[PDB]
């Protein structure tokens, strides 16, 4: 794979890399290097978990659905992958480098943050970094969406508060006013009701 | 540069900045600057010799300590915005050769990776094995253990 | 080029002969379809330097249950339209006896006209339809399901039948496209007719306030 | 007629819908509790599959009334259930599929 | 527009203690500074390429109309926190201004007016570089930043 | 065609503008804070670039050569002293439109040559 | 939406006494092609010049002819612009302009003209629908999207065609262009849906981009729910915002 994305890099250098349609040539850059790294951790994830044997615990905690998914066994024992920051491989806070160590203008895997350790072998020191700015969008979504969703579930409950079905069946706001002739247009409760095939159809 | 090793005109505190593609050079003394030291790099080779350890190893009763290792000019105090123009190598195995030259240029080495971590987080065991949120959260539940 | 504005006068004339048959005065079926090249033989290709005009693109059509109702549809040949200009198409709505009228703007309607519809209530109605507005039969789309204007002996039977008050019925605004269309007036109630995926279909009422 | 309805109201003929009563397990349910051997004839005739339904039909009431509008408003209420529910229990998967007694 | 299509990108200075905007030229013969050549020589250190020119040209149009030095103090003065009885003791308003509250730490005393004039002149420098996109804009979070 | 530039007087050290003499037809250079005039020589005025397809070569500094965190190939030789060492490097400039091609800059002291592949 | 600004190469205001001096090297020739049997000069001909440079790549991607920008260039601003242009012969594809003709039979002319440039490279329109930014092309892969058609045997055929998505929105004029579908066409904005297609397309189409957030994770919410709020909203008669 980090062979693979020397040459992608290498022809982008001789102007050799034609832009896709409706891409700048950073956009079509950009992709195809996604393209190829998420192949490779797609692939050793994937070699990872045709190894494990019938005994394995990881496996057993996976294959029920109990805890784990299998995007966790990947990362323990075959490669951690690609880290993204707000949606975009790791940035420039350097003027045109990553980190100190790097050198200016280096856009292959290990520059921009493709961590290629698993948890197990561990992680180099600045693959922890960039494992660390990637951490820091989970923590900060999570503080940010909180207060975001709960003034929107407080909007929805005061403008419907108070919508109730009527003993004709019909529902009413409280002034009366008939939001529907019937609930929901067939009248039915949704706790009772399937799923279901018409097999008529199709 | 040579000024400031030798610690004569200008306190290791000053830092200086040469930007070549705008042309300017910039000297700032100001206060609340933050940096860190690192190690010399002349050469392909390491400032920091042999004699260097032997002296420091002893240094109880030698009355010799890091302000003679940074009057040596061997370390170096290095802030943010002068670390845009320093190329540093993790270790001194980057320095040696590797046959496809990442960079032959590495003006700093640093001491120890692993003192980006600050107090809290300097407490947990083999912490780049851990996904990233769970060195934060001991870094929390650091300072609220009975002790 | 002239080949667009003989284009754009297809449409806009069979569009049009949709809302009169939606609306129901009597339209011929051939007028209800028309192909282009049968449309540039009747009025002939170029609009300008040629014989249509944008006038004498009028359309006279009669209610289906009374003969003497009628109605027009008026293509003015201005850009914008003003009170002289209205004044002359009530002129002559007074001279051949008629109420209701249409009227396709090409592109707006002076702010001195649009009262002077409204200032006329009961014996002329007038209606302002931009010349887009007609470029495209809403009712075709999906998003929008068949509505149904309704009688009055129809809306009683429905207010007795669900005990409602006219004003506990959901709304729909005499500013509303589907309320253009049908030429709806405030008080009369639309049927809305549409699919639904739990009740396989669904009557929806709406005032129109 | 029921086909040519669900056409229009499902295109993209995603079949998968969400109704009160699932048809298929209690067809299933009423073999077991039963003992229907289906390798053997049934003895349910089939026109009383078909009036079976059709009195089965009127005894689903969401919206009550005798009126012409009454009338037109539960046909639309119950009219995809109807429809779902004259396919499964149809005269003939009564008589090779679920052989129902 | 009609005046805003034709006139392009104009520069303009927002002052400390000055109600409103003023523009830069104004600003610069504020310091003592009567001909444009003088002005221009400032702002960009090299006449030899064009692409400044047509970035500066606009803001000497806007300009134009105010030609001395006591005009334009006095252009300045009836904007300050408020407006002088006599015009004279608006003048010796917007002098104290550019004195004391207009960049201080280059200096607060006298003949600094040269002094100012090159930094000053050298932030209208800088905003071309990112206006002709020369340079990178400044980062708000790099922390070299800050202190 | 030519990006133009600027001229100035040779009194007050204004800005000349552009001025069409009506009985010669002959473009004009004129301060407005006095009666100088000059006769234009290049004859064009305004000159704007869209399409802007810019030199790069002209803008880099052969100082760049001396900067220890860009990288250095001994592939591709000098093309005037035939020297090893070249540092090479991107655009770095906003409003590049898309370029990722590398210009080199030749090392070993006061070459300075710059080229680009 | 091409503004004349996405195909220009470069401009600039050039000075000519007279049109046959042609300070520009390659001009002279196709210049004194028009001017050997010169037509609305009668008046006299404006000194200034302005000529534009068009990019032979963006004009021959969107399939523009140099006899289109004329008309739309001529109409647009009317008989004070005189407007000429090579034949595609020329490997410099050339666009020259200057000030009405009759003009000569305030605002000076330098200025003037430069005050028309910095409007047309903006205000031209000569192509498309301004708002729309940019429309991308596709073969869409989901069923949703793709057109499905009822067989002679009722079985469903699912059809890939192009489908055309646009940054931005104008709604009214989209549906009414040629070739386009009036039926099928939609977009997630909703207060454009209002204003024209009214307010039961607002009740759909809001249930359509409710549903689309809500499922997207792969969640399921029941559509009873989804339909109550879409119901409170606009059973006022209009747009009824949660506020
Ligand atoms: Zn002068
Ligand atoms: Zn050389």
Redesign the pocket.
């Known amino acids: 794979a980090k062979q693979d994305v020397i040459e992608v890099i290498e022809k982008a250098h001789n102007n050799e890399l034609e832009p896709t349609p409706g891409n700048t040539l950073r956009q079509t850059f950009e992709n195809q290097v996604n393209r190829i790294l998420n192949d490779a951790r797609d692939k050793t994830g994937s070699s990872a978990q045709k190894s494990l044997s019938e005994y394995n615990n990881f496996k057993s905690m996976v294959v029920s659905g109990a805890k784990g998914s299998k995007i966790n066994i990947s990362q323990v024992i075959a490669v951690v992958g690609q880290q993204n920051v707000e949606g975009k491989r790791i940035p420039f806070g350097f003027k045109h480098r990553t980190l100190p160590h790097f050198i200016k203008d280096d856009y292959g895997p290990e520059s921009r943050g493709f961590v290629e350790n698993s948890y197990l072998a561990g992680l180099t020191p600045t693959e922890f970094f960039f494992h660390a700015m990637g951490g820091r969008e989970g923590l900060i979504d999570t503080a940010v969406k909180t207060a975001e969703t709960g003034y929107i579930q407080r909007r929805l409950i005061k403008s419907m508060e108070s919508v109730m079905v009527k003993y004709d069946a019909t529902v009413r706001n409280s002034i009366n006013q008939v939001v529907q002739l019937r609930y929901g247009e067939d009248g039915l409760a949704g706790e009772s009701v399937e799923f279901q095939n018409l097999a008529t159809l199709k | 540069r040579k000024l400031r090793r030798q610690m004569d005109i200008i306190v290791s505190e000053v830092s200086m900045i040469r930007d070549i593609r705008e042309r300017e050079i910039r000297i700032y003394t100001d206060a609340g600057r933050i940096c860190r030291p690192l190690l010399i790099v002349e050469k392909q080779k390491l400032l920091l010799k042999k004699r260097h350890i032997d002296q420091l190893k002893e240094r109880e009763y030698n009355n010799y300590s890091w302000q003679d290792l940074v009057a040596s000019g061997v370390v170096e105090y290095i802030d943010t915005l002068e670390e845009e123009t320093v190329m540093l190598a993790m270790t001194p195995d980057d320095l040696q050769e590797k046959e496809v030259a990442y960079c032959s240029t590495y003006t700093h080495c640093e001491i120890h990776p692993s003192m980006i971590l600050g107090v809290c987080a300097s407490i947990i065991p083999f912490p780049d094995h851990n996904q990233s949120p769970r060195n934060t959260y001991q870094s929390a539940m650091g300072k609220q253990a009975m002790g | 080029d002239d080949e667009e504005e003989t284009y754009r006068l297809w449409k806009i004339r069979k569009t049009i002969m949709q809302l009169c048959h939606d609306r129901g005065y009597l339209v011929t079926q051939d007028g209800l379809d028309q192909t282009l090249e049968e449309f540039k033989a009747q009025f002939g290709g170029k609009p300008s330097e040629g014989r249509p005009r944008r006038t004498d693109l009028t359309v006279l059509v009669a209610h289906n249950d009374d003969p003497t109702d009628q109605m027009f549809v008026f293509f003015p040949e201005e850009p914008k339209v003003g009170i002289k200009t209205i004044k002359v198409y009530c002129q002559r709505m007074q001279e051949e006896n008629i109420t209701r009228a249409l009227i396709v703007v090409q592109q707006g309607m002076t702010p001195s006209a649009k009262q002077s519809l409204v200032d006329m209530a009961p014996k002329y109605i007038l209606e302002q339809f931009l010349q887009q507005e007609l470029l495209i039969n809403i009712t075709e789309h999906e998003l929008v399901p068949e509505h149904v204007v309704m009688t009055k002996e129809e809306v009683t039977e429905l207010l007795a039948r669900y005990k409602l008050r006219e004003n506990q019925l959901p709304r729909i605004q005499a500013g509303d496209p589907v309320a253009r269309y049908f030429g709806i007036k405030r008080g009369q109630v639309v049927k809305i007719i549409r699919p639904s995926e739990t009740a396989g279909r669904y009557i929806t009422y709406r005032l129109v306030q | 007629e029921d086909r040519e309805v669900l056409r229009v109201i499902f295109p993209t003929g995603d079949s998968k819908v969400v109704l009160p009563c699932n048809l298929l397990r209690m067809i299933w349910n009423a073999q077991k509790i039963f003992h229907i051997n289906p390798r053997l004839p049934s003895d349910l005739h089939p026109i009383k599959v078909v009036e079976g339904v059709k009195e089965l039909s009127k005894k689903l009431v969401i919206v009550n009334g005798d009126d012409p509008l009454s009338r037109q408003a539960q046909e639309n209420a119950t009219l995809l259930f109807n429809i779902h529910l004259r396919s499964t229990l149809c005269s003939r998967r009564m008589a090779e599929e679920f052989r129902l007694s | 527009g009609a005046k805003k299509s034709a006139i392009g990108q104009r520069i303009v200075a927002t002052l400390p203690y000055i109600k409103q905007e003023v523009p830069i030229i104004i600003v610069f013969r504020a310091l003592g500074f009567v001909s444009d050549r003088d002005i221009l020589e400032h702002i960009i250190y090299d006449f030899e390429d064009p692409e400044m020119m047509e970035m500066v040209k606009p803001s000497l149009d806007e300009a134009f109309v105010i030609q001395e030095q006591n005009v334009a103090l006095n252009f300045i003065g009836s904007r300050g926190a408020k407006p002088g009885v006599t015009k004279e003791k608006r003048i010796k308003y917007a002098k104290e201004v550019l004195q004391k509250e207009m960049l201080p730490h280059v200096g607060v005393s006298d003949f600094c007016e040269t002094k100012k004039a090159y930094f000053l002149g050298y932030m209208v420098h800088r905003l071309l570089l990112a206006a002709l996109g020369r340079r990178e804009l400044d980062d708000r979070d790099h922390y070299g930043n800050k202190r | 065609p030519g990006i133009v530039g600027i001229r100035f007087?040779?009194?007050?050290?204004?800005m000349?503008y552009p001025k069409e003499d009506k009985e010669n037809r002959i473009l004009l250079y004129a301060?407005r804070?006095?009666d100088?005039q000059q006769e234009a020589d290049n004859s064009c005025i305004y000159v704007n670039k869209i399409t802007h397809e810019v030199d790069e070569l002209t803008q880099i500094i052969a100082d760049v050569s001396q900067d220890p965190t860009l990288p250095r190939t001994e592939d591709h030789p000098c093309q005037k002293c035939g020297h090893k060492e070249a540092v090479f490097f991107q655009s770095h400039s906003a409003r590049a439109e898309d370029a990722m091609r590398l210009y080199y800059v030749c090392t070993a002291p006061h070459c300075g040559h710059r080229w680009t592949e | 939406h091409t503004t004349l600004r996405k195909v220009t190469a470069n401009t600039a205001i050039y000075y000519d006494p007279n049109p046959q001096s042609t300070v520009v090297a390659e001009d002279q020739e196709w210049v004194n092609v028009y001017y050997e049997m010169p037509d609305f000069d009668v008046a006299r001909i404006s000194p200034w010049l302005l000529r534009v440079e068009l990019d032979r790549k963006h004009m021959t991607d969107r399939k523009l002819t140099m006899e289109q920008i004329a008309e739309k260039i001529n109409a647009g601003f009317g008989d004070d612009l005189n407007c000429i242009f090579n034949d595609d012969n020329a490997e410099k594809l050339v666009l020259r302009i200057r000030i009405m003709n009759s003009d000569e039979n305030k605002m000076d002319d330098d200025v003037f003209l430069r005050c028309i440039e910095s409007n047309m490279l903006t205000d031209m329109t000569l192509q498309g629908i301004e708002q729309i930014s940019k429309v991308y092309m596709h073969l869409p892969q989901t069923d949703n999207k793709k057109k499905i058609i009822i067989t002679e045997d009722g079985e469903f055929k699912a059809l890939q065609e192009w489908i055309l998505e646009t940054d931005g929105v104008s709604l009214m004029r989209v549906l009414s262009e040629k070739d386009v579908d009036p039926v099928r066409t939609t977009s997630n904005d909703i207060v454009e849906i209002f204003t024209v297609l009214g307010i039961e397309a607002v009740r759909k189409a809001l249930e359509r981009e409710l549903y689309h957030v809500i499922s997207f994770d792969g969640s399921y919410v029941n559509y009873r729910h989804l339909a109550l709020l879409c119901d409170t909203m606009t059973c006022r008669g209009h747009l009824m915002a949660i506020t």
Not at chain 6, 9 to 14: A, D, F, G
Request: aromatic share 10%; hydrophobic share 10%; proline share 0%.
């Open positions: 007087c040779q009194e007050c050290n204004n000349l301060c804070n006095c100088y």
